[PDB]
Amino acid sequence: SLKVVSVDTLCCDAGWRNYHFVKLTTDEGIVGWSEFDEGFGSPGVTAVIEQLGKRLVGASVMEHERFFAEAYCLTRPATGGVVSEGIGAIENALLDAKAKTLNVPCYELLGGKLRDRVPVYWSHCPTWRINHPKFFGPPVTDLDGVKRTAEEARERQFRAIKTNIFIHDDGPLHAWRPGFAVPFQPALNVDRKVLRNLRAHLEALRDGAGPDVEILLDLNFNAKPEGYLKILRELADFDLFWVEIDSYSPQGLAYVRNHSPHPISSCETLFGIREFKPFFDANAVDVAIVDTIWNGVWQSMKIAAFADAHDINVAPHNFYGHLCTMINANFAAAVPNLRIMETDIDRLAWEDELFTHAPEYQNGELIIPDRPGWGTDPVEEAILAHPPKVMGGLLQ
Amino acid sequence: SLKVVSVDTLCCDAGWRNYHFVKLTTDEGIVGWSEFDEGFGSPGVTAVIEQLGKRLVGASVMEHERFFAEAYCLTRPATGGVVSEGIGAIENALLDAKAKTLNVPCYELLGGKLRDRVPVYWSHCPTWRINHPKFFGPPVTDLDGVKRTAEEARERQFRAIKTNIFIHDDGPLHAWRPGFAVPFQPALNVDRKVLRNLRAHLEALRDGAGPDVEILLDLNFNAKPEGYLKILRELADFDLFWVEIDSYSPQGLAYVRNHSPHPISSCETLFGIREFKPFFDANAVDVAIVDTIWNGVWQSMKIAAFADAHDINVAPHNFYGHLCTMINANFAAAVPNLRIMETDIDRLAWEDELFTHAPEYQNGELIIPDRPGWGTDPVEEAILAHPPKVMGGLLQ
Amino acid sequence: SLKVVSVDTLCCDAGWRNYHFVKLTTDEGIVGWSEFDEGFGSPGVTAVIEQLGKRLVGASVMEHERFFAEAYCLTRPATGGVVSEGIGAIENALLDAKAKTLNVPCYELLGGKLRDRVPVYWSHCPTWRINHPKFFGPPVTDLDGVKRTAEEARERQFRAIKTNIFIHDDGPLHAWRPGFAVPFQPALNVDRKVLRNLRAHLEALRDGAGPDVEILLDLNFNAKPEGYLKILRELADFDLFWVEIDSYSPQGLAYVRNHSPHPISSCETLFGIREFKPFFDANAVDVAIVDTIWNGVWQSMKIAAFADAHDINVAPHNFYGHLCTMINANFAAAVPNLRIMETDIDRLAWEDELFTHAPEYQNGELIIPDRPGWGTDPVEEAILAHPPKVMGGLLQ
Amino acid sequence: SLKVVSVDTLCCDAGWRNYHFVKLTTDEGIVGWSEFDEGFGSPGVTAVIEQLGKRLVGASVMEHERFFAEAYCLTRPATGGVVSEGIGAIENALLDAKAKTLNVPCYELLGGKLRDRVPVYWSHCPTWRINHPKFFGPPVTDLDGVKRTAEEARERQFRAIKTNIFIHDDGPLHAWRPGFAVPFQPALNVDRKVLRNLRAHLEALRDGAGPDVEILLDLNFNAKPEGYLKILRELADFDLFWVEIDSYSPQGLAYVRNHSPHPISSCETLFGIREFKPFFDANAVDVAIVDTIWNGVWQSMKIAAFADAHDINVAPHNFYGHLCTMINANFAAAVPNLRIMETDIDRLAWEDELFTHAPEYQNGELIIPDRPGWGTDPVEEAILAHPPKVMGGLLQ
Ligand SMILES: [Cl-]
Ligand SMILES: [Cl-]
Ligand SMILES: [Cl-]
Ligand SMILES: [Cl-]
Ligand SMILES: [Cl-]
Ligand SMILES: [Cl-]
Ligand SMILES: [Cl-]
Ligand SMILES: [Cl-]
Ligand SMILES: [Mg+2]
Numbered sequence A, B, C, D: 001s002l003k004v005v006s007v008d009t010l011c012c013d014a015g016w017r018n019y020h021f022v023k024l025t026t027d028e029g030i031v032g033w034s035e036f037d038e039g040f041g042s043p044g045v046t047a048v049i050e051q052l053g054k055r056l057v058g059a060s061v062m063e064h065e066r067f068f069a070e071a072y073c074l075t076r077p078a079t080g081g082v083v084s085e086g087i088g089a090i091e092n093a094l095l096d097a098k099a100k101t102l103n104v105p106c107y108e109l110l111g112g113k114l115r116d117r118v119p120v121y122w123s124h125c126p127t128w129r130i131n132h133p134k135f136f137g138p139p140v141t142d143l144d145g146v147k148r149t150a151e152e153a154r155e156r157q158f159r160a161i162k163t164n165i166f167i168h169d170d171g172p173l174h175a176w177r178p179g180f181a182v183p184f185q186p187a188l189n190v191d192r193k194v195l196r197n198l199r200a201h202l203e204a205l206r207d208g209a210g211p212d213v214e215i216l217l218d219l220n221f222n223a224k225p226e227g228y229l230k231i232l233r234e235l236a237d238f239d240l241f242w243v244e245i246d247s248y249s250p251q252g253l254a255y256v257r258n259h260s261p262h263p264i265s266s267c268e269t270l271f272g273i274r275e276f277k278p279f280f281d282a283n284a285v286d287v288a289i290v291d292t293i294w295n296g297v298w299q300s301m302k303i304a305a306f307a308d309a310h311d312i313n314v315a316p317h318n319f320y321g322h323l324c325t326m327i328n329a330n331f332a333a334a335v336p337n338l339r340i341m342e343t344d345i346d347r348l349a350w351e352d353e354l355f356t357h358a359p360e361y362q363n364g365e366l367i368i369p370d371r372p373g374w375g376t377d378p379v380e381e382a383i384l385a386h387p388p389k390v391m392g393g394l395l396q
C-alpha cells in the first residue's frame, strides 16, 4: 500500500544526555529511522512528534514534502524551534523509509553522491574529556592534557579539531558557558580572565597539534558582539580555521565578522531559508552551519542551495549518536558546497551496541556508506538495555 | 521564605480545544496562576513547562526576570515558539504570585494603571457560531445569520467586531483556512471564489452592523503577498477598522501594507522585541498585535515600549478562557499605546464554572478589576469536572 | 488614600556643584525621594519639576506611568533635555514612594533582582583629584600623582578606573575640555599636544594600575569624528576597557567605531528609546551608557530592554551623590544586560552627613541593599547645614 | 565699549498664557529685545536665560555667534528643548541690539531683504474664538460660527486660514487635543467621531471661505501614523493647502506623507539642522516649519539654507505676540525659499498697548517694516500694567 502504519519514538541513555529516535513502519514492513535530540535546549520535541505522527498514519511514505507542507500549516503559528525539530525528525525517518523502499542509500534521493569520502574535524576536542570525563576518557584536567589530546588527534590522522572556552587558572579546570547559564552571568561579559585562559588553552592545543592540524574555536552564545570583538582582537595572531559564533543578531554578527581576521561560522540553531536569509543578506558568515537533524535533510538541501547562490559553503551540525552521523554523511555526500563535516570522535563505551553499523574513518575522512537508507539502524534490544535518565544536556 | 515550592500544570475541556494552566505555589501558601494554550499550533508547551519548573523550585517567587534570564539561557538554541510559550506561561504565574504576595492587582507591577476600562472588539464574530456551533450558539449557517450576529453585536453595545474568511456559495457554509491546511492547498492561492465570498460575507455583516460599528477582517496566514494584494484591491471600498495579516516576510508584509487602503495589523505569533523589530524597521504594520499569553506579560511590556518608540499602538491577542482575558486586561490597563483589546464574547456553557470571576463588560468596554493578581482563579474542582480531550485547535 | 499630597525640591552644596532632590509625600505619610542635577548643562530642571508637580498632587502615587504619559503630553513640544530630566526626577521619587508603600526595595518593582552585587569602575580617577582638589584629595598635580592614584585603586581592590583628557606639559596640570568651553576652542581640533599628553597620562596610569586593573578613557564631546579617529590611532596599542565618546551624529560615531581597535561607549546624554535608536541602527556603540537619573528608572528599563534586543550591554551614568548611586544600584540589580556600573569613589568630606545610608563596596563590587525604596534618604537637617551656592558644574 | 551691560527677562499677561521677553542693554545704551514663550510645553526657559545671560555680561554685543558657540558648549549635554529655547531668545535680543547699534533693520543682518511684503495665513482660525472666547471674540460655538469666521477671513482679504480638530456633535463645541492630554487618551486613537467631526467642520469652513481662500489643517501631535493615514484617507477629496503633522518619527511621518494626497508640513518643534536632517533625508515633508523664536533667527537662517538645498520651502512658526511677528517678518524678508508666513489675526484687547508698533497687513500680506532692529519694542510700563498669571498654555 506504501502507507505509513505507525510512528513511534524511542529514547536511551547517552550518559549526560539521552538519545531519541523516530521509528516509522510502512505497510510493506519497511522501518525508517531518525535520531533527534532534546538536551540541546529543546524540551518538547517528543510531544510534537507524537501529535504530528498521528496525522501521518495512513498517508503515503513516499510523499514526504506533502507531509512537511501539511505539518508546516498545522503548526504555522509556533514554527521554528521545538516544533520544527519534530517535523525534521519525522522527515528524516520518512526519507530513510523511502530510500529503503527503493533499495537505495539516502543520498540517491538527494541528487546522487558527488563524493565518496568527507573530511571531518574532531569536535568537542578536548571539550568532551574535560566536561564529561565519566563518559569520555582519558579525563583532561590540565594544560598538559589539552596538549596530549591534540597530539592524539594528530597521530590518528585527523586534520582538524574544535575546542570551546575553558578556565584553567581559577581552581579545577572548568568550561566557561555563561550563554547556557554555566555560570549564571547573563550579561555574558568577557573579562581578562576569559581572554588569558583562551590564549593559554589554544597555545597548549597548538603545541600538541603541530603546525599542520587545523584548530577551530567555538564560542557558542557566550558573549555579546562587544565581547566577541575583544576575543577576536586578543586572538588576532592565532591560526584558526574558523571562529564559531551563535547570534540572533544578523547586524551584530556581521559587524563582528567585518572586524575578524579569522573566518566566522554560525547558524547551527537556525531553521529554513527564512532564518538563514538575514545573515546572508548582512554578509554575516564565511561558513553556514546547517543542522539537518533539526531541519530535516530535505529542508537542509534547500538551505544548502540557498547558501550556494551566495557562494557560501556549509557544514553539518553533528554532535550526537552514530545515526545522526550517518544522516549527516548522506547530506555531505550530495552537497557540492560542503566546507567540512563535524563529528565527535570521543564515543560512549556502549555507542557501538546501540546501532547496527558504526561510521568508518580513514586518513581523516568519513567513508560514505552505500547501504539502503541512512547507513545504520538503532537496535531495539540495545536501546532497552540502556534506559534513559531524566533530561540532561543544557537542562542538567 | 518567598520560595517557589511547586510548579504544576492542569488541563480541561474547552469543547474543540483544551485550556491549560500553570499553578505555582509559594512557601507562604500563595498560589499564582496562568493560562496557556497548545491547540494553536503548539504541541509541547506542557513538556517545556514541566522541565523549566523543576529549576524554579527553591528560587524566589519575586525574581521573575532572573528566572526568565536563566530560562532563556538554558533553552537558547531552540528559543521562540513552544519553548518561549512555556517560559511565558511560567512568567505569568510568577507575576500573579508576586502581585498576590504584595496584595496588589497585577497592573501595580506593570507601571500602575493608566485607564479603568478598555474598549474591546468582539472577536470571532460570527466565526465561532459558524465554525464551532456545537459550542457557541445560535449556529450561523447562512448570510442572514451573519447579518443577525452583527445586529446582535450592535444591540449589545459592542463598538467593533472581527470576522475571518467564509465560503457561502459552495455547499454548506464553511471557513476558508488553507494557511492551516483546511483545506489542504498549500500554495494559498486566492481565486474568484474567495473574493466574491469575502464580499458577500462582509456586505451582510455591514448590513447587520450598521454604519457605526467597526468591522475588522482577519486573514491569518491564508494567502501569499500576491493574494493579500488581490483581497485588499477587491475590498478597497469597504470601511474596515483593520485587515489582519500574519506573515513571516517583513518585506512582503511591508509591500502589502504600502498598497493597502486599510490599516494593517499583524504580529500575533511573534516573540520578543527581536522578532517584532524587522517588521517595524520595514514599516510593515499600522498596529502590532502582541500575544502576552505566549510572551509573558513582562516581556510584552518591553515589546509595547519598543512599539511606542515607533509610534505604533498595540493590541493584545486574546481568544482563550477568562484567565487569559484577565491577564490581557492587566496589560491593557498599563500600556499607554493601546489600540484596542480583543475578546471573544461567545462563551462556552461551562466557562463561568471554571473560574472564580468572569470579565465584566459595560457599554462596549472591559472593566479592569482591582483584586490581587490577575483578577480570576481557575477552580480546581471545576477543572476536574471537565476532563480534557486529545489536542484540538489546529491539530483537530 | 494613596494620593500624592506634595512635591517639593531641595538643594544643597556639593562643593563645585549642588545636589538637588525631589521630595514627594503621600497621604499615608510615606516620603519618596530622588536626586537630580542641574550643573551638567541643565539649568531649568527645578522649574520643570515645580510646574509638573502641581498636576501630580491629588493623583495616585501608584500610577507612575500614568503621570509619565500625562507629563509627556503636556511638554511634548519641548521634550528631551531639561524637560525630560524634570520628568525623570519625579518618576524616580514616585518609584521610591511606591516601593516604600509596598515595603520593598525598588528593584522589586523592576523585575526583581537578578544579582546581589555589581562590579564597578572608579570614575573620575584621577579627574576629581586634579580638577577639584579643594574637595577631593589628595590633590594630583603631576604624572607621579596620576600613577599613585591608580596604585591606590589597585590596592583598594577596584578592578577598573576611568580618566579623561589632561595636559601635563604646558604649565600647571589642567583638564582639556573644549567640548564644554574649557578652553574656548569651539572647532574641537586635536593637535600633537593633546595626543602626546594623552599618551603620557595613560602610560603613568597603567604604570600605577598594573596589568590587571582595567583602564577606561572618557573623551566626552571634546573632538569631532576626525579628532576621535586621530586619538584612537594614536592609542591603538593601549589596552583600554572602553573609549567613551559623546556625539549627536550617529553616522559619525559609527564611522569612528568602525575604525576603533577599542570598545566604544556612548549615549550618557540621550533620552528614551527614540534617541538611542539611531545609534543602535547605525552600529555606533559597543556599550550604551544610560542616565537613569535623567530618564527615570522605569523609562531606563525600556531602554535596557531595547539594547538587550540588539545584544548591547548597558552601563549606568552615575557621578553624583549617594542617592543617585542607590537609584542606579537598583537598576543595575534588575537589568540582565549590564556591562558594569560607574561610581565616583572620591567623596566630599560631608557626603555621608547628607544621607541616612552610604553605598557599601567589597572586593571591587557595590553591594545592592535590601531596604524599602532606593536604599538611602537625604537628611533634611543636613541639607540645611550645607546651603547651596550658585550653579556650578559646567556653568561655573 | 560695545559690551553687553545687562540681560534681563520680563513677563506679562496674555490671557490664557503669558508673554516673556529678553531685554539686553549695551554700554552705549542700546536696548535689544526678544520675545519667548514657556506655555507651549516649555517650563524653565527663563531659568536657562538667567544663567546664560550671566556669562554674556561683559562680552561684545556684536559677537552673537561666539555667544551661541559658547552657550552650546556649556549646555551641550542637555541641548535642544528648553535649553535651546533660552539660547535662541538671547540670540534674538543680541540680533536686535546689533542691528540697532548699526542703525539697520534686522533683515540687513540676514542677507538684506529680498521681498517687501509676505503673504500670510490667518492661523488659529477659528481655533482662538472656539478655545479662548474670553480673549478672542466673537465666540464661536457652532458650525454656523465656523462658517462665519471663514467668511470674515475672505472679506478681510486673507488668502488662507488654518484650523485644528474640533468635536461638534458631542455636547458643547470643544477641541480635540489628546496629544496634549486634552482629553487624556494617550494612545491617540482616531475613531469615527473624530473623522465625522473633521469633515463637518471643514465643510462649514469651506462653505464660508469660498473656493479661492486656502484652508490649512493642523493635526499637531494628535495621532499616531495609523490615525494620520485614516484622517488623510477620509479627507482625500478636500482641497487642503497643507496638512500639518508633528512627529518624532521621521520614518513614520515619511510613510504618512508617501500616502497623502495633500501637502504635508511639519517640524515646528525641531532645533537645528541636526534635528531637521533625518526628516529631509526620509522625504518626510513638503514644507518645513521653522520656529525662529525657539531656534534664534541666525540659527534659523542655517536651517533655511539646508532646506533650500533639498528644494524645501520653509514657513515660520508664529503664534505669539507682536514682537514674535516682527522677528519672523525679518526672517521672512530674507529667506528665498519661503512658503508662507503664519500669523494670528485674532488679537488680545491689550495687544497694541504692549508694543510700540503693530504689524501692518494689506491685501492679505504682512508689510515688512524698515525701522532699526526687529520693528517693535515691548513697552515696560504696559508690561507692568498687565502682570502675568501662573503658567498657562499647555500647562493650564
Ligand atoms: Cl537529554
Ligand atoms: Cl552578568
Ligand atoms: Cl487543544
Ligand atoms: Cl495548492
Ligand atoms: Cl550645580
Ligand atoms: Cl577653535
Ligand atoms: Cl504661559
Ligand atoms: Cl488612550
Ligand atoms: Mg527562530
Ligand SMILES: [Mg+2]
Pocket: A218, A220, A244, A268
Ligand atoms: Mg557550535
Ligand SMILES: [Mg+2]
Pocket: A079, A080, B080, B081, B271, B275
Ligand atoms: Mg520565530
Ligand SMILES: [Mg+2]
Pocket: B218, B220, B244, B268
Ligand atoms: Mg489574528
Ligand SMILES: [Mg+2]
Pocket: C080, C081, C271, C275, D079, D080
Ligand atoms: Mg535630544
Ligand SMILES: [Mg+2]
Pocket: C218, C220, C244, C268
Ligand atoms: Mg562620560
Ligand SMILES: [Mg+2]
Pocket: C079, C080, D080, D081, D271, D275
Ligand atoms: Mg529633540
Ligand SMILES: [Mg+2]
Pocket: D218, D220, D244, D268
Ligand atoms: Mg502647528
